[PDB]
Amino acid sequence: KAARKSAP
Amino acid sequence: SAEWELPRLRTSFIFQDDYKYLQDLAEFFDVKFYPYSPPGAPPVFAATSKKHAVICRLTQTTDKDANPCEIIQLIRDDGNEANCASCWSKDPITDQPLLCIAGNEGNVKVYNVTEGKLYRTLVGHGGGINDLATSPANPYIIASASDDTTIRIWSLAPEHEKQPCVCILGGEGHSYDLLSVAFHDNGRYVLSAGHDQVINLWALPEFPNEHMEIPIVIYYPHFSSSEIHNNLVDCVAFYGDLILSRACHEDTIVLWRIEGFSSDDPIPGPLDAPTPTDMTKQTRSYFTPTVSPQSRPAMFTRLAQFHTPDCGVQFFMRFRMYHVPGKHPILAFANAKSKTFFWDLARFGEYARFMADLKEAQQSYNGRVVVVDQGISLAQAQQVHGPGVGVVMKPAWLVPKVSASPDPDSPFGFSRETLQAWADMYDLSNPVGLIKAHRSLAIDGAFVGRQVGWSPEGEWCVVVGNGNRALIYQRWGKERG
Amino acid sequence: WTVDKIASALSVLAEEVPQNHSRLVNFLLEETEKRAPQPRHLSKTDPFAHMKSKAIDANRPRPEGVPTMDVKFKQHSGEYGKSRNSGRRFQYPVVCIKPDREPVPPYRFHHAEIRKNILALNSQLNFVPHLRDVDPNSAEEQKYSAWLMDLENLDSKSGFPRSQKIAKRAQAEYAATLAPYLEPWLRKLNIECTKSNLIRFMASQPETPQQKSNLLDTYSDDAVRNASMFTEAWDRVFNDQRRVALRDILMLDKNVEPIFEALMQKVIDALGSYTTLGCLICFSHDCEHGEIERDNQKRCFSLEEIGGLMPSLRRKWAAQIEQPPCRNECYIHGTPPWSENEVGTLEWMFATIGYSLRPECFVGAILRPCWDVHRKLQELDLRLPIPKQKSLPWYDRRKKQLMSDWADATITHEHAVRELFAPCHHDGPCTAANGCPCASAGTHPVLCERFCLCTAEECPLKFTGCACHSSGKTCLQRQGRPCICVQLNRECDPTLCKGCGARERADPENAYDEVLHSTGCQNVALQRGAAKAVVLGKSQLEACGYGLFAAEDIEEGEFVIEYTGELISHDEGVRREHRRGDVFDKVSYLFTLLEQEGIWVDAAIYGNLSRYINHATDGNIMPKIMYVNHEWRIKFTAIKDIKAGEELFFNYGDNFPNLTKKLEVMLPGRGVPPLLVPKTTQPLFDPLSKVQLLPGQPLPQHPIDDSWLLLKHRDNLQDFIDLRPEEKEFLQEWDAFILRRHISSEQYLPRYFLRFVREKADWLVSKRSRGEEFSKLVATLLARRVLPERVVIEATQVLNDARGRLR
């Protein structure tokens, strides 16, 4: 859904 | 020989966590090879973590167990900000290497790396800096992309020392945080992109070789579009006059072109730029060709899509092309699920030539076509099979598993499975097709690729990412068995 | 032929599409590869050669004093990148480099200066504002997704679906790819099927009229029409349930998409573009005046807004009846076939010159000898086609004075409660009984203004300027008899306020004529435009970003600066503020201009240095909304004596809450409740370069650059389907010139018109259509009584001199 900049 | 050779993993390193006390927080966001060394000099790269700049030299070894990577400099940014951006420049007086580092404070720090000193700071942005790029036409010209939604163009030349901001790319071209900035080879065109999903092409004027009291402000890009991708754009680059870009949630690197754009044409002036007159038009261009059956001609053409699987919802992942005269152009990118991908762009052309010849021979000889590998001449092969048989020369790298062979044991043609596998990697006939990587390498552990770097001679490919990890791929190595 | 056969044949032709695409991409890759650039700016030597590895073995003790960082290396070999061993760890000394410069105070967008408020369009959110990372299935993910939903709820509520947008974009690209193939394919198939025949079939098929009427009007319906068979075959092959119906390609075609009292009627028709777009205030055809509807359609503040040409032209003729020869073979030797457009030129000129200056000389100068147009004029035989009201008890237009309970009898001066209506243009008196909006549209009557068609002799609501006249300073915020203009919260009219003398003082060419402004009118500061010297700096208020500082001494009562920006609606302000928001964590540049009407000024991008004036309940400046020549503007006046170097402050008012620093309906914003760098403890900045300034050095003052703004207006005209290329050409040229003059008063129009005629003399006589379009402008301006006869006589001489020099 939402974009993520940091590593999971 | 070995022009077709693709990289293999040679070395990897984990640099100590430097952010855990300030999601797993430590990352190498950038990697850049020094571009101004003499031909044949040992390649040097700077890998930028949130708090450090790790400067390494690579030397080819004859020993598989020997370490080709040496760290010659390690700088700590003793500020209270996280960095993510870098580019190289040179001192206009000494010609010494200058490493520019930028992050969330919004200043460009310029380091004298050989001496371990701060040379200068570029102050002026209103938010964090996400990307930096040095002009290929002038090593003293640097562009920075920021959360303030603008691009500032800076000059390190002595004549601009008092006021180093030569140009501001402002107006309303962008409405949100910028993630990527890239220069054309000519140093007169700039590409910018970010969260607003707009990709803008700007034309820079000539900057006077004297003190500029104010930067030149540019209000309008000459080409603008939010139509290539349907998501935030985090990486943009020119590939000659063509464009390469990636967006979040798409699992592709898009190769496309601006219609009517040629860098051989005169550089347009600021008032030649289109303006957003109709808010319903999500693409506008000064370059648009006048001849088309469409009332509003197409302003861009999607050319191809490099398949980059398993990037998921991850963004701030950058790809890099090795583009030097006399060597094959190679695209490299690492996904969000521990894989490194490579495409040799010269393979496309040979494959296209081989399939065109194979298609022609099948029609002319009613499928009686014998394929022979390059590396036996075409002329001598034709004598062996006779005049009733068509002979096609096939590149040696194109390995088996246009119509397919009638039966499995037929002497003519290839199986449907062979042809499909080849088409997946090399067919460029479909703009919305997915080009399978020519090489896909697994990475141990959980790794998200942030940036890729190529050495001047293309024998090294460095991929950096999360956990402060660097992966060093090699080709044309000197290792002895 | 049959559907089955055409489809089978199109399937074979369609094979050209991936074949040509692969040829294109491959050719482009090969050309790019060939043109790869040689590395440039290479150094003569390896700058890194002397530098040795800084590695210290893991087994060694850590160095004393200097910080150390570890690196662990692994070596790899084989096809699968297998590790050769567990690795080797090394210690590295760290070079610690402290930054020495702080960043500038934060900001969003490039802050560009505008001389005057600019009109904005309504906007939609076309992206996903990413604020921070949110963990999946968390309170923060929910908070973020609720904010995005709220943003989407504002756009649906604005009056302007992802899955469809993705499908549409993909279809639009596939339609652009196939469009160049249709005609070559139609030729190859050679069916007795042409594009025109396929557009005709589409128009004669559901599914909107009169759009289908417009198409059939140009195309008609014309033997055996097997356009149907080709259409079905095309849909079978290219529109499978990347898809596209023949309809989608045809709708984007160049020959389809763009097709989506007699003398007086000819004149009205001829002058249409000029009467519909020509601004009553600034005289440009694309400007900052007018209204923007919810769908971004624009209602220009033009002659159309006041009933068109005829109500104004009829009044001019009446005002005429109640009241040197040319150097181009004048009619004086009186009495080549004349085209329709030439006849028309004489017609609109004859009509608008009216019961006057003669049309002959001017038509001759635009077209021909003066006698030629005199005899054609006689051949054509062209012919042209007070109920005493009681004075109001609260207003005397003869004495130019307010009396009695006037503050309760009118809302003329109460801009915050005013709703805007078109100037009145009815025949009878200006009363509620006769439906006059000036008299009845608001809660109380408002005065009739300069654009109302009524005159001062017949109408008791007619504003007639102020009576002020003095050898000293006049039209003061406190006067013998007070200034009606000051009382009504308006600036003096350069035409109506005679002898105060707003004529000279509201003229920007006299802005820095200090001797002139020492006497006369003190109520034209916004028009004069001479702001006090100011300097951007870092605010004295703790963690409060930028602030504005005085760069000269300002005395109490002096005009300081105007608040400029983008003119937006309340709804656009809500959309903007929410899009720029952060649900996880302040800075606004909104100013309410007209509360009741819903007009706000946004200086987030375009404005001036006044956008940086911070809040203080006890300020040293005061904002005020003024009516200035039918424009509402914000001016700042000093409420204390301010010294060079002091920070400027004003009370933002009741509608801006959390401003504690000292020493969908809710919209927060401000509301009315040798020059040297000055000495200050505060860092001062150049507004563009953001470089710091040194006190004692010359104050930077950069002239405003409006070429980007002139470009936007030119391009707006260019994108109109309704305008003809010949009209676009003239209108763009006139507007590029007139927009630069920032006119708000008819008083200065003759001077700028003359300068236009003198400068464009050669360009105008060089092409027949330019002179024609120019005469249409002059006709509209004469009809409006704005352009005096004497300047039209002068333009004749300038134009007649321009040709002949051209020979």
Ligand SMILES: Nc1ncnc2c1ncn2[C@@H]1O[C@H](CSCC[C@H](N)C(=O)O)[C@@H](O)[C@H]1O
């Ligand atoms: N007295 C006050 N107390 C707190 N914040 C204030 C203030 N006066 C102004 N501000 C801040 O300034 C904003 C108005 S914009 C004024 C310029 C601004 N300081 C800048 O650096 O660009 C407000 O939204 C608020 O964030």
Ligand SMILES: [Zn+2]
């Ligand atoms: Zn106007």
Ligand SMILES: [Zn+2]
């Ligand atoms: Zn005459």
Ligand SMILES: [Zn+2]
């Ligand atoms: Zn009226």
Ligand SMILES: [Zn+2]
């Ligand atoms: Zn009236």
Ligand SMILES: [Zn+2]
């Ligand atoms: Zn009126």
Ligand SMILES: [Zn+2]
């Ligand atoms: Zn007065």
Ligand SMILES: [Zn+2]
């Ligand atoms: Zn007055």
Ligand SMILES: [Zn+2]
């Ligand atoms: Zn006055």
